[PDB]
Amino acid sequence: FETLRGDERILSILRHQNLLKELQD
């Protein structure tokens, strides 16, 4: 059972941001 919270979309977007971020801070 998947917990449909909606936040999973943000998770995957942030995961995408993590892939886009190929530079350090």
PDB file of all heavy atoms in Angstrom:
ATOM      1  N   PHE A   1       0.843  -1.217   0.000  1.00  0.00           N
ATOM      2  CA  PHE A   1       0.000   0.000   0.000  1.00  0.00           C
ATOM      3  C   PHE A   1       0.868   1.253   0.000  1.00  0.00           C
ATOM      4  O   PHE A   1       1.722   1.428   0.873  1.00  0.00           O
ATOM      5  CB  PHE A   1      -0.921   0.006   1.226  1.00  0.00           C
ATOM      6  CG  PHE A   1      -1.764   1.244   1.353  1.00  0.00           C
ATOM      7  CD1 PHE A   1      -2.820   1.469   0.485  1.00  0.00           C
ATOM      8  CD2 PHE A   1      -1.499   2.183   2.335  1.00  0.00           C
ATOM      9  CE1 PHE A   1      -3.593   2.606   0.592  1.00  0.00           C
ATOM     10  CE2 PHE A   1      -2.270   3.323   2.448  1.00  0.00           C
ATOM     11  CZ  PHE A   1      -3.322   3.530   1.595  1.00  0.00           C
ATOM     12  N   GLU A   2       0.654   2.117  -0.982  1.00  0.00           N
ATOM     13  CA  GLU A   2       1.349   3.391  -1.034  1.00  0.00           C
ATOM     14  C   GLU A   2       0.549   4.456  -0.303  1.00  0.00           C
ATOM     15  O   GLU A   2      -0.659   4.593  -0.505  1.00  0.00           O
ATOM     16  CB  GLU A   2       1.590   3.820  -2.485  1.00  0.00           C
ATOM     17  CG  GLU A   2       2.554   2.918  -3.235  1.00  0.00           C
ATOM     18  CD  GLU A   2       3.872   2.755  -2.507  1.00  0.00           C
ATOM     19  OE1 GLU A   2       4.706   3.682  -2.560  1.00  0.00           O
ATOM     20  OE2 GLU A   2       4.090   1.690  -1.888  1.00  0.00           O
ATOM     21  N   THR A   3       1.225   5.202   0.550  1.00  0.00           N
ATOM     22  CA  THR A   3       0.591   6.262   1.304  1.00  0.00           C
ATOM     23  C   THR A   3       0.490   7.525   0.457  1.00  0.00           C
ATOM     24  O   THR A   3       1.460   8.273   0.318  1.00  0.00           O
ATOM     25  CB  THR A   3       1.376   6.547   2.595  1.00  0.00           C
ATOM     26  OG1 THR A   3       2.785   6.554   2.317  1.00  0.00           O
ATOM     27  CG2 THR A   3       1.071   5.503   3.658  1.00  0.00           C
ATOM     28  N   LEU A   4      -0.687   7.750  -0.118  1.00  0.00           N
ATOM     29  CA  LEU A   4      -0.900   8.875  -1.019  1.00  0.00           C
ATOM     30  C   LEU A   4      -0.983  10.177  -0.234  1.00  0.00           C
ATOM     31  O   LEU A   4      -2.057  10.615   0.179  1.00  0.00           O
ATOM     32  CB  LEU A   4      -2.167   8.666  -1.852  1.00  0.00           C
ATOM     33  CG  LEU A   4      -2.474   9.769  -2.866  1.00  0.00           C
ATOM     34  CD1 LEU A   4      -1.366   9.873  -3.902  1.00  0.00           C
ATOM     35  CD2 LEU A   4      -3.811   9.511  -3.539  1.00  0.00           C
ATOM     36  N   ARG A   5       0.171  10.777  -0.027  1.00  0.00           N
ATOM     37  CA  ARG A   5       0.282  12.019   0.723  1.00  0.00           C
ATOM     38  C   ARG A   5       0.462  13.203  -0.215  1.00  0.00           C
ATOM     39  O   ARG A   5       0.234  14.351   0.160  1.00  0.00           O
ATOM     40  CB  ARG A   5       1.471  11.940   1.675  1.00  0.00           C
ATOM     41  CG  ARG A   5       1.325  10.882   2.756  1.00  0.00           C
ATOM     42  CD  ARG A   5       2.679  10.333   3.164  1.00  0.00           C
ATOM     43  NE  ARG A   5       3.249   9.476   2.121  1.00  0.00           N
ATOM     44  CZ  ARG A   5       4.549   9.397   1.835  1.00  0.00           C
ATOM     45  NH1 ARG A   5       5.431  10.143   2.490  1.00  0.00           N
ATOM     46  NH2 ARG A   5       4.963   8.565   0.886  1.00  0.00           N
ATOM     47  N   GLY A   6       0.886  12.915  -1.436  1.00  0.00           N
ATOM     48  CA  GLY A   6       1.181  13.965  -2.391  1.00  0.00           C
ATOM     49  C   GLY A   6       2.636  14.382  -2.343  1.00  0.00           C
ATOM     50  O   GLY A   6       3.226  14.730  -3.366  1.00  0.00           O
ATOM     51  N   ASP A   7       3.219  14.317  -1.147  1.00  0.00           N
ATOM     52  CA  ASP A   7       4.606  14.728  -0.931  1.00  0.00           C
ATOM     53  C   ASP A   7       5.589  13.882  -1.739  1.00  0.00           C
ATOM     54  O   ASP A   7       6.725  14.293  -1.954  1.00  0.00           O
ATOM     55  CB  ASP A   7       4.982  14.657   0.550  1.00  0.00           C
ATOM     56  CG  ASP A   7       4.278  15.696   1.400  1.00  0.00           C
ATOM     57  OD1 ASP A   7       3.143  15.432   1.850  1.00  0.00           O
ATOM     58  OD2 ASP A   7       4.840  16.793   1.603  1.00  0.00           O
ATOM     59  N   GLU A   8       5.150  12.707  -2.186  1.00  0.00           N
ATOM     60  CA  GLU A   8       6.001  11.830  -2.984  1.00  0.00           C
ATOM     61  C   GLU A   8       6.426  12.537  -4.272  1.00  0.00           C
ATOM     62  O   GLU A   8       7.517  12.303  -4.793  1.00  0.00           O
ATOM     63  CB  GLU A   8       5.271  10.527  -3.316  1.00  0.00           C
ATOM     64  CG  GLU A   8       6.151   9.492  -3.996  1.00  0.00           C
ATOM     65  CD  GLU A   8       5.386   8.262  -4.441  1.00  0.00           C
ATOM     66  OE1 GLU A   8       5.120   7.384  -3.591  1.00  0.00           O
ATOM     67  OE2 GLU A   8       5.037   8.168  -5.637  1.00  0.00           O
ATOM     68  N   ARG A   9       5.562  13.420  -4.764  1.00  0.00           N
ATOM     69  CA  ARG A   9       5.867  14.215  -5.948  1.00  0.00           C
ATOM     70  C   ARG A   9       7.010  15.174  -5.665  1.00  0.00           C
ATOM     71  O   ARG A   9       7.908  15.343  -6.485  1.00  0.00           O
ATOM     72  CB  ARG A   9       4.631  14.989  -6.407  1.00  0.00           C
ATOM     73  CG  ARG A   9       3.653  14.157  -7.215  1.00  0.00           C
ATOM     74  CD  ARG A   9       4.214  13.831  -8.588  1.00  0.00           C
ATOM     75  NE  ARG A   9       4.590  15.043  -9.318  1.00  0.00           N
ATOM     76  CZ  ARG A   9       5.404  15.058 -10.372  1.00  0.00           C
ATOM     77  NH1 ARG A   9       5.933  13.932 -10.833  1.00  0.00           N
ATOM     78  NH2 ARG A   9       5.693  16.209 -10.959  1.00  0.00           N
ATOM     79  N   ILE A  10       6.981  15.783  -4.492  1.00  0.00           N
ATOM     80  CA  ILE A  10       8.036  16.697  -4.085  1.00  0.00           C
ATOM     81  C   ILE A  10       9.336  15.930  -3.881  1.00  0.00           C
ATOM     82  O   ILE A  10      10.414  16.409  -4.234  1.00  0.00           O
ATOM     83  CB  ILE A  10       7.666  17.457  -2.789  1.00  0.00           C
ATOM     84  CG1 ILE A  10       6.418  18.316  -3.015  1.00  0.00           C
ATOM     85  CG2 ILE A  10       8.830  18.322  -2.319  1.00  0.00           C
ATOM     86  CD1 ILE A  10       5.933  19.018  -1.767  1.00  0.00           C
ATOM     87  N   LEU A  11       9.217  14.725  -3.336  1.00  0.00           N
ATOM     88  CA  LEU A  11      10.363  13.854  -3.130  1.00  0.00           C
ATOM     89  C   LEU A  11      11.058  13.581  -4.459  1.00  0.00           C
ATOM     90  O   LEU A  11      12.273  13.734  -4.576  1.00  0.00           O
ATOM     91  CB  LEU A  11       9.908  12.542  -2.463  1.00  0.00           C
ATOM     92  CG  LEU A  11      11.019  11.618  -1.938  1.00  0.00           C
ATOM     93  CD1 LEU A  11      10.440  10.621  -0.951  1.00  0.00           C
ATOM     94  CD2 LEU A  11      11.704  10.871  -3.075  1.00  0.00           C
ATOM     95  N   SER A  12      10.284  13.201  -5.471  1.00  0.00           N
ATOM     96  CA  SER A  12      10.850  12.875  -6.767  1.00  0.00           C
ATOM     97  C   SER A  12      11.412  14.118  -7.450  1.00  0.00           C
ATOM     98  O   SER A  12      12.418  14.045  -8.157  1.00  0.00           O
ATOM     99  CB  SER A  12       9.806  12.182  -7.645  1.00  0.00           C
ATOM    100  OG  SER A  12       8.627  12.962  -7.771  1.00  0.00           O
ATOM    101  N   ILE A  13      10.780  15.263  -7.221  1.00  0.00           N
ATOM    102  CA  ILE A  13      11.284  16.519  -7.765  1.00  0.00           C
ATOM    103  C   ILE A  13      12.608  16.878  -7.105  1.00  0.00           C
ATOM    104  O   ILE A  13      13.572  17.238  -7.781  1.00  0.00           O
ATOM    105  CB  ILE A  13      10.286  17.686  -7.585  1.00  0.00           C
ATOM    106  CG1 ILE A  13       8.999  17.417  -8.371  1.00  0.00           C
ATOM    107  CG2 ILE A  13      10.917  19.000  -8.034  1.00  0.00           C
ATOM    108  CD1 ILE A  13       7.922  18.454  -8.141  1.00  0.00           C
ATOM    109  N   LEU A  14      12.655  16.755  -5.785  1.00  0.00           N
ATOM    110  CA  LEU A  14      13.873  17.023  -5.036  1.00  0.00           C
ATOM    111  C   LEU A  14      14.960  16.026  -5.432  1.00  0.00           C
ATOM    112  O   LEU A  14      16.136  16.376  -5.516  1.00  0.00           O
ATOM    113  CB  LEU A  14      13.599  16.959  -3.531  1.00  0.00           C
ATOM    114  CG  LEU A  14      14.779  17.322  -2.628  1.00  0.00           C
ATOM    115  CD1 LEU A  14      15.297  18.718  -2.949  1.00  0.00           C
ATOM    116  CD2 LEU A  14      14.372  17.228  -1.167  1.00  0.00           C
ATOM    117  N   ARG A  15      14.555  14.788  -5.694  1.00  0.00           N
ATOM    118  CA  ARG A  15      15.470  13.777  -6.207  1.00  0.00           C
ATOM    119  C   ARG A  15      16.033  14.212  -7.556  1.00  0.00           C
ATOM    120  O   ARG A  15      17.210  13.998  -7.853  1.00  0.00           O
ATOM    121  CB  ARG A  15      14.764  12.425  -6.336  1.00  0.00           C
ATOM    122  CG  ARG A  15      15.655  11.329  -6.897  1.00  0.00           C
ATOM    123  CD  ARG A  15      14.905  10.014  -7.016  1.00  0.00           C
ATOM    124  NE  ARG A  15      15.738   8.955  -7.585  1.00  0.00           N
ATOM    125  CZ  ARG A  15      15.265   7.792  -8.024  1.00  0.00           C
ATOM    126  NH1 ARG A  15      13.967   7.525  -7.944  1.00  0.00           N
ATOM    127  NH2 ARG A  15      16.091   6.891  -8.536  1.00  0.00           N
ATOM    128  N   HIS A  16      15.191  14.839  -8.368  1.00  0.00           N
ATOM    129  CA  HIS A  16      15.622  15.359  -9.660  1.00  0.00           C
ATOM    130  C   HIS A  16      16.562  16.541  -9.466  1.00  0.00           C
ATOM    131  O   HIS A  16      17.547  16.682 -10.184  1.00  0.00           O
ATOM    132  CB  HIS A  16      14.428  15.768 -10.526  1.00  0.00           C
ATOM    133  CG  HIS A  16      13.688  14.611 -11.126  1.00  0.00           C
ATOM    134  ND1 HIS A  16      12.803  14.744 -12.175  1.00  0.00           N
ATOM    135  CD2 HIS A  16      13.702  13.295 -10.815  1.00  0.00           C
ATOM    136  CE1 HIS A  16      12.305  13.563 -12.479  1.00  0.00           C
ATOM    137  NE2 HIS A  16      12.833  12.664 -11.670  1.00  0.00           N
ATOM    138  N   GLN A  17      16.262  17.372  -8.472  1.00  0.00           N
ATOM    139  CA  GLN A  17      17.125  18.499  -8.132  1.00  0.00           C
ATOM    140  C   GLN A  17      18.488  17.988  -7.683  1.00  0.00           C
ATOM    141  O   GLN A  17      19.516  18.617  -7.933  1.00  0.00           O
ATOM    142  CB  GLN A  17      16.507  19.356  -7.015  1.00  0.00           C
ATOM    143  CG  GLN A  17      15.169  20.004  -7.365  1.00  0.00           C
ATOM    144  CD  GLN A  17      15.216  20.806  -8.650  1.00  0.00           C
ATOM    145  OE1 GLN A  17      15.571  21.984  -8.645  1.00  0.00           O
ATOM    146  NE2 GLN A  17      14.814  20.190  -9.752  1.00  0.00           N
ATOM    147  N   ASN A  18      18.482  16.836  -7.019  1.00  0.00           N
ATOM    148  CA  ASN A  18      19.708  16.204  -6.543  1.00  0.00           C
ATOM    149  C   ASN A  18      20.565  15.731  -7.714  1.00  0.00           C
ATOM    150  O   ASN A  18      21.794  15.768  -7.651  1.00  0.00           O
ATOM    151  CB  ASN A  18      19.366  15.031  -5.611  1.00  0.00           C
ATOM    152  CG  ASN A  18      20.588  14.281  -5.114  1.00  0.00           C
ATOM    153  OD1 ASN A  18      21.205  14.672  -4.125  1.00  0.00           O
ATOM    154  ND2 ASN A  18      20.919  13.170  -5.759  1.00  0.00           N
ATOM    155  N   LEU A  19      19.909  15.296  -8.783  1.00  0.00           N
ATOM    156  CA  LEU A  19      20.606  14.853  -9.988  1.00  0.00           C
ATOM    157  C   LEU A  19      21.116  16.046 -10.793  1.00  0.00           C
ATOM    158  O   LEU A  19      22.171  15.975 -11.427  1.00  0.00           O
ATOM    159  CB  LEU A  19      19.684  13.995 -10.859  1.00  0.00           C
ATOM    160  CG  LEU A  19      19.256  12.660 -10.247  1.00  0.00           C
ATOM    161  CD1 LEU A  19      18.282  11.938 -11.167  1.00  0.00           C
ATOM    162  CD2 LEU A  19      20.469  11.783  -9.972  1.00  0.00           C
ATOM    163  N   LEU A  20      20.358  17.137 -10.767  1.00  0.00           N
ATOM    164  CA  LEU A  20      20.740  18.356 -11.471  1.00  0.00           C
ATOM    165  C   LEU A  20      21.898  19.046 -10.761  1.00  0.00           C
ATOM    166  O   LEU A  20      22.768  19.639 -11.401  1.00  0.00           O
ATOM    167  CB  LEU A  20      19.546  19.312 -11.574  1.00  0.00           C
ATOM    168  CG  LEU A  20      18.348  18.784 -12.368  1.00  0.00           C
ATOM    169  CD1 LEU A  20      17.211  19.793 -12.347  1.00  0.00           C
ATOM    170  CD2 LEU A  20      18.749  18.466 -13.802  1.00  0.00           C
ATOM    171  N   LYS A  21      21.908  18.961  -9.438  1.00  0.00           N
ATOM    172  CA  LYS A  21      22.970  19.556  -8.645  1.00  0.00           C
ATOM    173  C   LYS A  21      24.234  18.710  -8.731  1.00  0.00           C
ATOM    174  O   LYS A  21      24.438  17.790  -7.941  1.00  0.00           O
ATOM    175  CB  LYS A  21      22.537  19.698  -7.185  1.00  0.00           C
ATOM    176  CG  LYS A  21      23.575  20.381  -6.308  1.00  0.00           C
ATOM    177  CD  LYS A  21      23.128  20.452  -4.859  1.00  0.00           C
ATOM    178  CE  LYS A  21      24.185  21.106  -3.985  1.00  0.00           C
ATOM    179  NZ  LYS A  21      23.752  21.198  -2.568  1.00  0.00           N
ATOM    180  N   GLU A  22      25.067  19.020  -9.709  1.00  0.00           N
ATOM    181  CA  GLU A  22      26.335  18.323  -9.883  1.00  0.00           C
ATOM    182  C   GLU A  22      27.484  19.205  -9.415  1.00  0.00           C
ATOM    183  O   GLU A  22      28.635  19.024  -9.813  1.00  0.00           O
ATOM    184  CB  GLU A  22      26.522  17.935 -11.349  1.00  0.00           C
ATOM    185  CG  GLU A  22      25.394  17.069 -11.882  1.00  0.00           C
ATOM    186  CD  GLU A  22      25.588  16.685 -13.330  1.00  0.00           C
ATOM    187  OE1 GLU A  22      25.296  17.518 -14.214  1.00  0.00           O
ATOM    188  OE2 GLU A  22      26.051  15.554 -13.593  1.00  0.00           O
ATOM    189  N   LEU A  23      27.153  20.156  -8.556  1.00  0.00           N
ATOM    190  CA  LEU A  23      28.122  21.105  -8.039  1.00  0.00           C
ATOM    191  C   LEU A  23      28.010  21.180  -6.525  1.00  0.00           C
ATOM    192  O   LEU A  23      26.922  21.035  -5.964  1.00  0.00           O
ATOM    193  CB  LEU A  23      27.897  22.489  -8.653  1.00  0.00           C
ATOM    194  CG  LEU A  23      28.100  22.572 -10.170  1.00  0.00           C
ATOM    195  CD1 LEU A  23      27.751  23.960 -10.676  1.00  0.00           C
ATOM    196  CD2 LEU A  23      29.532  22.218 -10.547  1.00  0.00           C
ATOM    197  N   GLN A  24      29.139  21.395  -5.877  1.00  0.00           N
ATOM    198  CA  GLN A  24      29.209  21.401  -4.428  1.00  0.00           C
ATOM    199  C   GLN A  24      28.877  22.779  -3.872  1.00  0.00           C
ATOM    200  O   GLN A  24      28.699  23.741  -4.623  1.00  0.00           O
ATOM    201  CB  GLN A  24      30.603  20.962  -3.965  1.00  0.00           C
ATOM    202  CG  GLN A  24      30.835  19.454  -4.004  1.00  0.00           C
ATOM    203  CD  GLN A  24      30.565  18.827  -5.359  1.00  0.00           C
ATOM    204  OE1 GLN A  24      31.447  18.761  -6.215  1.00  0.00           O
ATOM    205  NE2 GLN A  24      29.348  18.341  -5.554  1.00  0.00           N
ATOM    206  N   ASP A  25      28.786  22.865  -2.555  1.00  0.00           N
ATOM    207  CA  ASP A  25      28.457  24.117  -1.891  1.00  0.00           C
ATOM    208  C   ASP A  25      29.707  24.719  -1.277  1.00  0.00           C
ATOM    209  O   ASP A  25      30.202  24.169  -0.272  1.00  0.00           O
ATOM    210  CB  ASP A  25      27.387  23.907  -0.813  1.00  0.00           C
ATOM    211  CG  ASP A  25      26.105  23.328  -1.371  1.00  0.00           C
ATOM    212  OD1 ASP A  25      25.290  24.097  -1.928  1.00  0.00           O
ATOM    213  OD2 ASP A  25      25.895  22.101  -1.256  1.00  0.00           O
TER     214      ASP A  25
END
